[model samples]
Target: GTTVCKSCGMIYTASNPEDEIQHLQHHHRFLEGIKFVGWKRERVVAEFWDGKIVLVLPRDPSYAIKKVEDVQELVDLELGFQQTVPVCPDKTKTFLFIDEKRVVGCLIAEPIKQAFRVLWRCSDVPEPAICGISRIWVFRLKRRKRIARRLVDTVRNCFMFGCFLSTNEIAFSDPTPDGKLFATKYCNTPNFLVYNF
Candidate 1:
């Protein structure tokens, strides 16, 4: 797991330490009930590569791209249940159209892998969430790096453990639903291309 300092949210790839000195000084304590409400628009280009899709995520160097609560939502998305769940999707009632065609979502493999612990949490089921980076945290300098890392890791694991589609995103088609525009959510939509299996 990426060590995102609770205080400043600075990412550190090292493993968790046994001492509290470094943690306390270098990292911010992620307190309970710390709320930060914000949104963004992330434009990504996902290319269908060899058996996998190469998602060219956006990057920036002005800020960091991450959030505490957003991680939970990302977990839900990794599960492919974004639109499937109620009370989600900006509180859209019977949001059939939202998921009808242009509505983005995700999916997952029935079986899970052993690398689960290295992951954050949840993501045991097949849930679909929008892939737009807009829902992510702030737009900082390492914005692209952070988003790219998360995107690639998610895509890889989703294929190894699960697979899903962000209906509103440029997803690898084969693994997603097929429709036209309004009636069918699969096979439709723009940028529908297949590079690999």
Candidate 2:
């Protein structure tokens, strides 16, 4: 019979061995996170007691890119996103939060010039923004920690070569309710900037 995993939310047939195996593997990945062996030459952006953040450029080596794609697949699945579209490498930067040798967090950022400030009602005015948080995610077990904030903090510090960005300069892309709450607290304002596709 069809069954749904309460933790990972994967739907599968519990009676079928193949489906059960698939769900088991996926559930582990969803909860524990994907394994990420250290890269030969990682761009270490930030270091913390719990984990370290590594920045991966689009033009990085194939192995690095493969890990990003792998992690992206899991993130998309969790977010209920359909197949991801190809993003321009030249404009995108991927940050991985590695904890206990696992890629537990991911933040994909891109350069942007303008975004709309979130308001209680409809607003059409676009404000200037320097960076866009295209996507941000953390493993289920890794939530409530400071992983997401650290990822964004690293982005603010390292998104550009030497320029440190402020909260207002960074915008979130169509945030979920959770994201909105985080953004509001992080930005210290009810009206945080957001960009839409």
Candidate 3:
């Protein structure tokens, strides 16, 4: 097993010291939190070129989407608990990593309001329409394929840069150990929220 960072959940086995230092600095300095702008209307933002994954706003009715009940079942079966959450059509978007024409894993995101506080300690800097990840789940059988990381990247690509909702950070709602690890590995700034609750 690889030794992982307690604070950021970074693995030490497949490592680089310089990269680690850069991570500590960029995340701990230069930027506390970011503000969001307006968002584009619901649509499919990206799909794997080989046609395995798809990222779309939940309001997209014709994306071969999975129902919340479907996601709840997968989450319960894989995580051993029920997540009593619904896909708020107006607020949530879904990213799915599809294999064999079925949803193997999914990520859910929502827009944070302008007045919403970002960062645990850096709450003073308020952000607009920041994309907040509400939840993500993949069947245990699908682990280690980098599907979760890809899903988040697709979401971020859709919003940032020249896209409609410009933002510099993606927020994780409540991170699990696995989520924390994935975020620290893939987030643009290599920082993820550490939710105390």
Candidate 4:
């Protein structure tokens, strides 16, 4: 029978041992994030005192790609997104924040031509934008440390070759309430750019 986990909010079939085991794995990943030891070679984009950000691309090795896929699955679950459409590796860049041998944060960015500026009246006019933040997430215990901001800063510096994008040039994709607040504070304006996918 289908049951909802009160602690982690996971819905699974209780009768099936396989499903229970799956739920257990998902619950752990959802709470603590996936284990990611240092790789032989990683595209380290930014380095901080606490952690470092690694960039993953489509042409990266299978193991690297697999880590991104696993993290994406957990991110999707947390975001309440149905896992029907996977992230397009060719069109997007995945950035992972590694701290204490765990993948604690992730940011997915994509190139975009235009976006809509979020205004008080909720305008729909499209404006020119260079990059779109498709998804940004930090593990439950890893929030409130400016990790998301660092991810954005690294993306601005590394998304395009020889170009550092300003906050106005990058937009978010349908931000949640927390995301909207972060964008406003990060951009230093209530009006921030947001895009629809």
Candidate 5:
């Protein structure tokens, strides 16, 4: 049955705390959207000024969600994180745009609490949606290709039809400077809040 939150009056249902946690996760949507509609995969060719040609393709599905095996390798190549990007507690779906098997761009998303920072009341718990981009990047040399936006658009399309719970406001976790700019461009607004973990 559904119950109303004492703090916000928003109604929600959970048989138990466990059920509530899983239901709040959008895992089903992320998985099912990939399996059923495989339409997001696309291959594009980009040509740069110095005659550098690159081929871009969708990341394989098996490695789609938090399978960060080579993340540190990319970092060694100056891909940005000082340490290996931490995997999520909740499973996450990631899109790694590759060029010649080298990662050129990436985007990751999972279920998250889209809450507001207020007082000490735990009742201020935000509703869970397929919210918050966990990580995203585009190699600096390949920056101007619009690849990042296209990758974001692909994920955006996948969440259409409620196939996955669409992100609640296209939320983001603590983002880097470039990450912030990318979110602003792809999300079409710089109005997102910096959610404290």
Candidate 6:
């Protein structure tokens, strides 16, 4: 049946709107990529961090994901809105970013009309340690409650995770909580992007 994408409930078929959307998204190779946005779950959320966007899956209540979780998910989630960073823009073409709808944040990939991937957004961040949560965050965190210390810890983990999404290689720039700048190092090996954070 030369029909539409039953998986997405989209009316369009291959080489139609959806396939067209896919074509414009890749400037070259996207072997190392991610879902980065769309179809979000209650506990997890995706965000843009200027240079890149990442999904921050909070540790389960009883058990912390810890660093070990990264390896596990990297092996697993890569099968789902993921990309490498710092995300570069190609003047010659465009880059697409799919995402968990509920968790989409700041993205700057609107250069081409064909590149219809969710992008960088203001909703993709924290309370700035002083400023308040914006309406988008409010909507995003509808019932996702937070305790002071726990929220701060989650935010820290989120930041670290964003860096990890970039290089696909990991190196902690700041070893201490008091450190000002956290670093994400790149490697000679290519970065790998995973699905659904």
TM-score leader? 2
Report the candidate with higher lDDT, 4 versus 5. Answer: 4
Q: Write the per-residue lDDT of candidate 3 for residues 1-197, one digit (tens) a residue.
A: 25554432334543677766766764342112111112243244556653355555544544234344445554665566554354455667677676544456678776654333324343544545467777777645566777787777777766443664333445666566687677666654444442212
CA lDDT of each candidate?
0.28, 0.83, 0.54, 0.82, 0.48, 0.24
Instruction: Using TM-score, rank the candidates from best to worst.
Output: 2, 4, 3, 5, 1, 6
Candidate 3, overall lDDT?
A: 0.54
In terms of lDDT, which candidate is stronger, 1 or 2? 2
- Clash count for each candidate, listed in order shown: 37, 0, 1, 0, 0, 26
Task: Give the winner by TM-score: 2 or 6.
Answer: 2
Q: lDDT per residue, candidate 1, 15-81, as tens digits? A: 6664345656543333221223222432223322211122212242111123323333543443365
User: What lDDT score goes with residue 176 in model 3?
Assistant: 66
How many clashing residue pairs are found in candidate 5? 0
Encode model 4's per-residue lDDT on 11-88: one tens digit a residue.
889899999999998778654546777578899888999999999976888888888878887877677865223245
Please list the residue runs of candidate 3 whose C-alpha ends up more than 4 Å from where it truly belongs after superposition.
1-45, 49-51, 62-68, 82-89, 114-129, 159-168, 188-191, 194-197
Give the number of the best model, judged by lDDT: 2
Compare candidates 4 and 6 on lDDT and give the better one: 4
Score residue 15 of candidate 5 by CA lDDT.
61
TM-score of each: 0.20, 0.83, 0.57, 0.80, 0.50, 0.18
RMSD (Å) of each candidate, 1 decimal: 18.3, 3.8, 14.6, 5.1, 19.0, 18.1
Shift in Å, residue 164, candidate 3: 8.4
Cα lDDT tens digits, model 2, 18-115, are 99999988788765446877579988888999989999986789888888878888877777866334345577999999887888889989888898
- Alpha-carbon shift of residue 120 in model 6 (angstroms): 36
Q: Candidate 6: deviation at residue 53, Å? A: 5.1
Candidate 1 TM-score to native? 0.20
State the displacement of the C-alpha of residue 100, model 5, in Å, after optimal TM-score superposition. 3.5
lDDT of 1 at 17: 69
The residue-level lDDT of candidate 1 at 123 comes to: 27
